[PDB]
Amino acid sequence: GRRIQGQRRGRGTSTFRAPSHRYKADLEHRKVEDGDVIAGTVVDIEHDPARSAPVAAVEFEDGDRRLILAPEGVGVGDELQVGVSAEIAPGNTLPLAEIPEGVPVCNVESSPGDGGKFARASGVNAQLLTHDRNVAVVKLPSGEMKRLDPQCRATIGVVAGGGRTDKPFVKAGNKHHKMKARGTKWPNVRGVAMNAVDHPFGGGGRQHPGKPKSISRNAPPGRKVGDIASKRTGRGG
Amino acid sequence: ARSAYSYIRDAWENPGDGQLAELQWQRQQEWRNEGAVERIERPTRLDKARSQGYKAKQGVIVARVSVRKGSARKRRHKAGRRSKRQGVTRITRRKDIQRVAEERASRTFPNLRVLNSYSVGQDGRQKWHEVILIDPNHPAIQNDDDLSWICADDQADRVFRGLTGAGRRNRGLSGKGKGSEKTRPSLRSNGGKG
Amino acid sequence: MQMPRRFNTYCPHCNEHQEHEVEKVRSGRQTGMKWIDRQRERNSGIGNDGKFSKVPGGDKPTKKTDLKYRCGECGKAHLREGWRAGRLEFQE
Amino acid sequence: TGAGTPSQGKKNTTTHTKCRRCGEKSYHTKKKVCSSCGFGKSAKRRDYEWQSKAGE
RNA sequence: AGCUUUACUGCAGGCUGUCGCUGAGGACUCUCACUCCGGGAGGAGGACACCGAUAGCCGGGC
RNA sequence: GACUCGUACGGUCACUGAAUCCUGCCCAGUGCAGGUAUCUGAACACCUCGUACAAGAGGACGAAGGACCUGUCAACGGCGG
RNA sequence: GAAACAUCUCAGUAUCGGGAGGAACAGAAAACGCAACGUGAUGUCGUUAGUAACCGCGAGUGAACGCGAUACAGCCCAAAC
Numbered sequence A: 001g002r003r004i005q006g007q008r009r010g011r012g013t014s015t016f017r018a019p020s021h022r023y024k025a026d027l028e029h030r031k032v033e034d035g036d037v038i039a040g041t042v043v044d045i046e047h048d049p050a051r052s053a054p055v056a057a058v059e060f061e062d063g064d065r066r067l068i069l070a071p072e073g074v075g076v077g078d079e080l081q082v083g084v085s086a087e088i089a090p091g092n093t094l095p096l097a098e099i100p101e102g103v104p105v106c107n108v109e110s111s112p113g114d115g116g117k118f119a120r121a122s123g124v125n126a127q128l129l130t131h132d133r134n135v136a137v138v139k140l141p142s143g144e145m146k147r148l149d150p151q152c153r154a155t156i157g158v159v160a161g162g163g164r165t166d167k168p169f170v171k172a173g174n175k176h177h178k179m180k181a182r183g184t185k186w187p188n189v190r191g192v193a194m195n196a197v198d199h200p201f202g203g204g205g206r207q208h209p210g211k212p213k214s215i216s217r218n219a220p221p222g223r224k225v226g227d228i229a230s231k232r233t234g235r236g237g
Numbered sequence B: 001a002r003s004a005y006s007y008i009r010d011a012w013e014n015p016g017d018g019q020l021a022e023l024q025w026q027r028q029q030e031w032r033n034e035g036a037v038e039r040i041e042r043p044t045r046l047d048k049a050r051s052q053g054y055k056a057k058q059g060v061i062v063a064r065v066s067v068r069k070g071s072a073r074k075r076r077h078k079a080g081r082r083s084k085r086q087g088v089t090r091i092t093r094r095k096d097i098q099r100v101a102e103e104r105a106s107r108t109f110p111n112l113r114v115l116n117s118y119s120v121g122q123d124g125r126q127k128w129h130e131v132i133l134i135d136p137n138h139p140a141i142q143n144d145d146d147l148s149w150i151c152a153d154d155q156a157d158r159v160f161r162g163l164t165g166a167g168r169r170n171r172g173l174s175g176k177g178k179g180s181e182k183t184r185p186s187l188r189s190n191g192g193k194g
Numbered sequence C: 001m002q003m004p005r006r007f008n009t010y011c012p013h014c015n016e017h018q019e020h021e022v023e024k025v026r027s028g029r030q031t032g033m034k035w036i037d038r039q040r041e042r043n044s045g046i047g048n049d050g051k052f053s054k055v056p057g058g059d060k061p062t063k064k065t066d067l068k069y070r071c072g073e074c075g076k077a078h079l080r081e082g083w084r085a086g087r088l089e090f091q092e
Numbered sequence D: 001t002g003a004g005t006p007s008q009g010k011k012n013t014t015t016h017t018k019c020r021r022c023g024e025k026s027y028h029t030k031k032k033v034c035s036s037c038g039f040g041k042s043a044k045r046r047d048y049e050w051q052s053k054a055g056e
Numbered sequence E: 001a002g003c004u005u006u007a008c009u010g011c012a013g014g015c016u017g018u019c020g021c022u023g024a025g026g027a028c029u030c031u032c033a034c035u036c037c038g039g040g041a042g043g044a045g046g047a048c049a050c051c052g053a054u055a056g057c058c059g060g061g062c
Numbered sequence F: 001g002a003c004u005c006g007u008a009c010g011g012u013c014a015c016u017g018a019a020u021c022c023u024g025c026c027c028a029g030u031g032c033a034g035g036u037a038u039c040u041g042a043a044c045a046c047c048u049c050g051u052a053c054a055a056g057a058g059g060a061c062g063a064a065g066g067a068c069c070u071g072u073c074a075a076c077g078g079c080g081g
Numbered sequence G: 001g002a003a004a005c006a007u008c009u010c011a012g013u014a015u016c017g018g019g020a021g022g023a024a025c026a027g028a029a030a031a032c033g034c035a036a037c038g039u040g041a042u043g044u045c046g047u048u049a050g051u052a053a054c055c056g057c058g059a060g061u062g063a064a065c066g067c068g069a070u071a072c073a074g075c076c077c078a079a080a081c
């Protein structure tokens, strides 16, 4: 047969790449020798093409201009702070240690100083729960309990743009426009609609998968399709 | 009496014990951060170098080369192949790493010529060899009765034609009798069967 | 069929009739050092191994008689042609 | 649209041109590589053994 | 010839044990290689992982 | 190296195919996944035999996997005499 | 090709990568082993011989020592001091 679509993906051709050259900023937390002296003022609220959520343009005392992962509430004029001593209000960023338990946080770091990794999608937010001299348990938006180094920096508040998922796309055109600004090939042709040569589900005089859909984790690329290492399927039971 | 050299040599008979061990555990840290080919002012194994033709004089150069450990880095077949030729994993190359090292070095010094080379250890994923090269054009060598031979036109790119010592051993030319029927005078003259 | 564990018959060694004892030939064990054992290791490589890639064939409906005839006098055994027999049991 | 005659009409693009090195009209002005002598790709001149019968 | 599969035989790939890198005091501590985060100070991890070698299993992805 | 100037309101892999009323029963087989007293399960090292060595024979230990058990059908499919 | 075909064969061929010279390569024994009280660097030619050896012991594959010739040529380091 021929390589399946998932295999064409990896090659990184234009079709599968994201329009990076059209992206505004690689949102990442600022650095500070220490102290926390850093602070700036929101100048504008822009649209971020890579996340379909707003990003805030901020100006710091050291005249540094950078875009930030805008939580909800932040407006132009507002002043934000970054450091071990920053205030405990929405928009400010400080290590999990200096953050009071029970406070919604976003754009959490996985490794202190990595600039943020977790919870940075529209409306989501993490939840700092347990403190310690070593571990800072945080509940990520997926429900998992992530144990983290208390030195990992994070932003207070929930990410802006919440509720985006509530309104349906309604029409293909709308999807089309969104998909065009992402690293994704769209629309999607069903495997079962292809020829055997093209996909393990292809072929037949009627459309149905050849074998069962749940595939072993050990399956090789070219054959891993359908329900990957499913612990279960269906809704029942 | 023993020579000073004899001690360097005796220490390298067991690069895993004694001071040499502690020494390697150290150097390699720096080596793993160096390039593919690093010219070095002095041979790490003086006895070996001199023994192999080295000589503290103008026109004599030395460089340490690192090559990855393991079998061939081969691509699987993209057309019809009988089961015999469908291999990838177990296939190994017919030139030993030391010979690969000599070549990468010689290519780094286009004007020089490989005189010899020797192993200086290996970590878990690579091997290091120090190659002794010679400037066939420097008069300091054109006048050396022990090395001027390398200046002859027919010694040009000698490493790429397997005229090196490691080259000739890898070509199965060590034995002069039994077992060397398909090797001498040359692999190619013997229909490539060695 | 039934068969006497012992009985008189010609002993090719003594050149005279003696009382022999019948026993079923127990398979000897392999050394794994015969020439064929070496060639298997030698010749087996990447991909199909030719003959060494085959697997044992089936069986015949009935096997022949695989017996050793031991001479009670000189204690030496001898072999004979066998004969198809679904089952063979010795009497005593 | 026919892949034949009707698709011939759009062919007004220039690719292969006289080669500064070998003089053959094989210099792909978009690739900046000569399909004939390999100029632009190789310092050595393009030549393969299959350009003639194996025993010649 | 293309295609399929619980056809024959193999080949990638995945999982797994073992050896090398690899070090100090059947479960455990450690730091020094090695890995990663950090501009750096330095933080996390740590003889594991990665990588090289081998063995068993799965293996029409080829 | 793509995904990714991305981080679960994400994006990957599949099935179905707007709305509306709905979507029953079956986990035996096959698939996937979880577990597992016990059984099975390669090589290195280890023990025994063997060989002044070696080939080789046997043992002990036993990973994933399998047996066995469980979950799962908007998983492949099934819904008769 | 093996009257299929997988080892084998085609064949280390076709083709690809790198490089020298007017020739290249080889070369002064940790050789040979007509076992000797023998030969004496290396290529090459004739022979040894379709012999020994390999091989679903199938089809096929296939040397060497020696011998007769051609031409002959033997040296330099490392170390000891």
Ligand SMILES: [Cl-]
Pocket: A178
């Ligand atoms: Cl979407």
Ligand SMILES: [Cl-]
Pocket: B106, B112, B113, B114, B156, B157, B158, B159, B160
């Ligand atoms: Cl050279």
Ligand SMILES: [Cl-]
Pocket: C024, C064, C065, C066, C067, C088
């Ligand atoms: Cl019997």
Ligand SMILES: [Cl-]
Pocket: G039
């Ligand atoms: Cl002789």
Ligand SMILES: [K+]
Pocket: B082
């Ligand atoms: K063939």
Ligand SMILES: [Mg+2]
Pocket: A014, A015, A016, A017, A018, A180, A182, A183, A184
């Ligand atoms: Mg696109």
Ligand SMILES: [Mg+2]
Pocket: A026, F005
């Ligand atoms: Mg980023």
Ligand SMILES: [Mg+2]
Pocket: none
């Ligand atoms: Mg949706």
Ligand SMILES: [Mg+2]
Pocket: A188, A189, A190
């Ligand atoms: Mg579709």
Ligand SMILES: [Mg+2]
Pocket: A193, A194, A195
């Ligand atoms: Mg169709």
Ligand SMILES: [Mg+2]
Pocket: A001, A196, A197, A199, A200
């Ligand atoms: Mg297929």
Ligand SMILES: [Mg+2]
Pocket: A207
């Ligand atoms: Mg349908």
Ligand SMILES: [Mg+2]
Pocket: A207, A208
């Ligand atoms: Mg269907």
Ligand SMILES: [Mg+2]
Pocket: B185, B189
């Ligand atoms: Mg020749």
Ligand SMILES: [Mg+2]
Pocket: C044, C045, C046, C047, C048, C049
């Ligand atoms: Mg095999």
Ligand SMILES: [Mg+2]
Pocket: D003
């Ligand atoms: Mg056409």
